Amino acid sequence: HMVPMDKTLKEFGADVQWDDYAQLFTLIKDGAYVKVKPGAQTAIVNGQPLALQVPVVMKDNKAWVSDTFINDVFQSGLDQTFQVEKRPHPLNALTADEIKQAVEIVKASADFKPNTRFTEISLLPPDKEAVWAFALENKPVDQPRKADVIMLDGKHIIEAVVDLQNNKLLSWQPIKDAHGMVLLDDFASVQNIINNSEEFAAAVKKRGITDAKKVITTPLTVGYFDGKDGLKQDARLLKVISYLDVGDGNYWAHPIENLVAVVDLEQKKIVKIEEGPVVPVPMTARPFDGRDRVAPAVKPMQIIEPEGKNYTITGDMIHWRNWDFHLSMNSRVGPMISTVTYNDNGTKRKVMYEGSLGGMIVPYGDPDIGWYFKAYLASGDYGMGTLTSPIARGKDAPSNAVLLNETIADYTGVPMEIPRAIAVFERYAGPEYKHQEMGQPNVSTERRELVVRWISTVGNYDYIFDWIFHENGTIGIDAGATGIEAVKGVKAKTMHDETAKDDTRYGTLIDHNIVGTTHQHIYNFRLDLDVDGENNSLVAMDPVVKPNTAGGPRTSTMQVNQYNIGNEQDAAQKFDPGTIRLLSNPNKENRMGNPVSYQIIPYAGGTHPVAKGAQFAPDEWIYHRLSFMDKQLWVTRYHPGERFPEGKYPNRSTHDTGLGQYSKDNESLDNTDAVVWMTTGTTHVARAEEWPIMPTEWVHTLLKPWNFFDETPTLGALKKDK
């Protein structure tokens, strides 16, 4: 017996195209490009013939396929995109089995308390040296796979380490004064607590809300203010901001301004309510899903690769052109790109041991009650990998992308598969190079880039990260932001209203009674680059104008001031785009005797105003806790446990336990294992074009080979000589 083709393929996620003139179906799914004609005893998969026992059957205009069609075709082997890993890469993320195993081990421990939650269950980093030896020399890692198990027992954090090979607990260590990140049940608890609070219901009522059951809460971390916010440093608290649900699918457009509840999560109660002036909730329906819009007409546009892809995915390793890298997922920071090498005429040269988002923050500038403590440290406090937003095929990623599924542990320690977690796609990116010599045949070649895209949504705002590998050796890192703006309820409807000026002192009036409060988007990428080896140095090249001392008519020249940056403190700096900053290997040179290096460009542009620093006075607590927000470039000595710019436990942190801490000892950066950190930010002043939903805005960063190679990297394989 058989099934209906359209509905089944659609559910399966394939794109189905029917050409009535050619009597042909074109089916596409990830790396598979399939052609199949009704009645045919053969189908084509990536340009190769595939025998079909049961042909596609056309019945009264409906196509029907065998119940084994999806598998026979899409899992045939003619789609070579994915290959089986023979020898397991040491950096492969914990499998669902290993995650269950780690949880069983801690659950077996004597000190384990029922009720414990798991903030993070991830692979404990194997030693770097052995990992590269595995990647370059194929040498097995003889160290047992271990897992870091970070638990929250009520409000207490405990870090444990389990030996997976040997099935045993290695360490169990309580971490004094650390606060755990926000976990998913905290969202439900805050909503329930608020719903059962008699006093909150009364506060809401006086603010014009008739049906308290329509109140939507949103949990926010409270930060640290040395008690000026009046909050006990020892309680596990969350502040709660509320909106009214009016049924337009966008509660964010209906702020209940000046009403903040402080919830103690262990006690499950509201311990404080801050109330300021009553501002009538903006009630106009402002849907962003199109329910009230006309679906316009657009003709089809598809990017296709009929013979399959130029990249191969073996287990989690991706091979493409001269690039080789390992891609895995972490629950806190998302994708981890590792053991990145560039095959230079047969020799695989190291480029980056490990790269990933370090951490990020979206801090606000309004002093009002519902905003003063507002700051979203998205990855650290909320778990961006866990909150990954599955790619909407063909929209969040081009139609020629391949979408990968990724597995991580949820907060109860149960494996969770995130579908379409990361997109991989090659794309045309203009001419790689061109030279039209006058009177001669033109010379042009196309540029191809391989993009690794991941999206994560925390609350109202959606973040996109693209790791772009250019065939010429350059690596771009771009971050996109879209989503729904956090807005403030105001009485002005237009700038002609009496309260207009005061209502927009901290943000633009983007709609009647709604202000898009000013804030910054600050991203930080942690890049353990290893330029052609472990031992490198940080070098500065500042282009400058100097007096001409060579004679002739010119009064000046363009020269360069080159100097090494010897320690961490001098490497923590602002980045002037007019200058060049290189991570060089002083032990290896290119053909002209220049040290092989990579140019670090923390600021390659953006579509929103750029942040030059943190938009906070130096006496602000957020300023003192997060030093990473005020400098664009940081370079620190490699250490396996220094991975976050904001610190490992930033919820209610009292001091910098991140980049401020990692560079405080001011270690030497001369001919040593360096880790580059790039902070890139935006200062977002809003406008009406961004409401009810904000068009994606992007920021760009770049890493370019500098004298790493001896000539134009894409010219091609040399036809003559050795």
Q: Which of 245, 274, 620, 673 binds Ca ion (CB under 5 A)?
A: 673
CB atoms within 10 A of CB 133: 15
- By a kind-dependent CB cut-off of 5 to 8 A, residue 637 interacts, out of Ca ion, a copy of itself, Cu ion, none, with Ca ion
Does residue 188 bind a copy of itself (CB under 8 A)? no
Q: Which residue is nearest to Cu ion (CB)?
A: 684
Helix residue ranges, H only, 196-284: 198-205
CB of 666 vs Ca ion, minimal distance in Å = 8
Q: What residues numbered 624-653 form the site for Ca ion, per CB under 5 A?
A: 636-637
Residue type, 640: P
**Binding footprint of a copy of itself, residue count (CB under 8 A):** 181
Cβ proximity to Cu ion, 370 vs 483, nearer residue: 483
CB of 298 vs a copy of itself, minimal distance in Å = 6
Binding mask 677-696 for Cu ion (x = CB under 5 A): -------x------------
CA distance 620 to 612: 17
Q: How far is CA 269 from the centre of its chain?
A: 34
Does residue 395 bind a copy of itself (CB under 8 A)? yes
Binding mask 493-512 for a copy of itself (x = CB under 8 A): xxxxx--x----xx-xxxxx
Q: What is the spatial order of strands in the sheet that 62-66 belongs to?
A: 2-4, 62-66, 57-59
Per the CB < 8 A criterion, the answer to whether 161 and 147 are in contact is yes
Strands 312-314, 82-83: pairing kind: parallel
**Dihedral of CA 223/227/229/235: which sign?**
positive
Binding mask 245-264 for Cu ion (x = CB under 5 A): --------------------
Binding mask 590-629 for Ca ion (x = CB under 5 A): ----------------------------------------
CA distance 392 to 365: 33
Binding span for a copy of itself by CB under 8 A among 158-166, 199-207, 359-367, 647-655? 359-367
Q: What residues numbered 199-238 form the site for a copy of itself, per CB under 8 A?
A: 225, 228-229
CA distance 330 to 336: 7
CB atoms within 10 A of CB 402: 22
SS3 101: helix
Does residue 528 bind Ca ion (CB under 5 A)? yes
Per the CB < 8 A criterion, the answer to whether 128 and 638 are in contact is yes
Does residue 141 bind a copy of itself (CB under 8 A)? no
Does residue 530 bind Ca ion (CB under 5 A)? yes
CA distance 514 to 506: 12
Q: Which of 86, 176, 435, 722 binds a copy of itself (CB under 8 A)?
A: 435
Does residue 331 bind a copy of itself (CB under 8 A)? no
Question: What are the structure tokens assigned to 490, written together?
Answer: 């105001």
Q: Is the peptide bond before 287 cis (omega within 30 degrees of 0)?
A: no
Cβ proximity to Ca ion, 637 vs 700, nearer residue: 637
Alpha-carbon torsion, ordered 117, 119, 121, 123, to 10 deg: -160
Binding span for Ca ion by CB under 5 A among 73-81, 294-302, 362-370, 520-528? 520-528
Q: Which of 127, 289, 417, 665 binds a copy of itself (CB under 8 A)?
A: 289
The answer for 538, left when phi > 0, alpha when psi is -120 to 50, beta otherwise, is beta
- By a kind-dependent CB cut-off of 5 to 8 A, residue 673 interacts, out of a copy of itself, Cu ion, Ca ion, none, with Ca ion
Residue type, 200: F
CB of 420 vs a copy of itself, minimal distance in Å = 10
CB of 598 vs a copy of itself, minimal distance in Å = 11
CA distance 488 to 276: 13
- By a kind-dependent CB cut-off of 5 to 8 A, residue 418 interacts, out of a copy of itself, Ca ion, Cu ion, none, with none
SS3 312: strand
Does residue 417 bind a copy of itself (CB under 8 A)? no
Does residue 667 bind Ca ion (CB under 5 A)? yes
Question: What are the structure tokens assigned to 538, written together?
Answer: 């940080």
Angle at Cα 305 formed by Cα 299 and Cα 311, nearest 5°? 140
CB of 392 vs a copy of itself, minimal distance in Å = 4
Query: Which residue carries 């542009």 as its tokens?
Result: 605
CB of 672 vs Ca ion, minimal distance in Å = 9
> Which residues of this protein are in contact with Cu ion, per CB under 5 A?
684
Residues that bind Ca ion (CB under 5 A): 528, 530, 636-637, 662, 667, 673-674
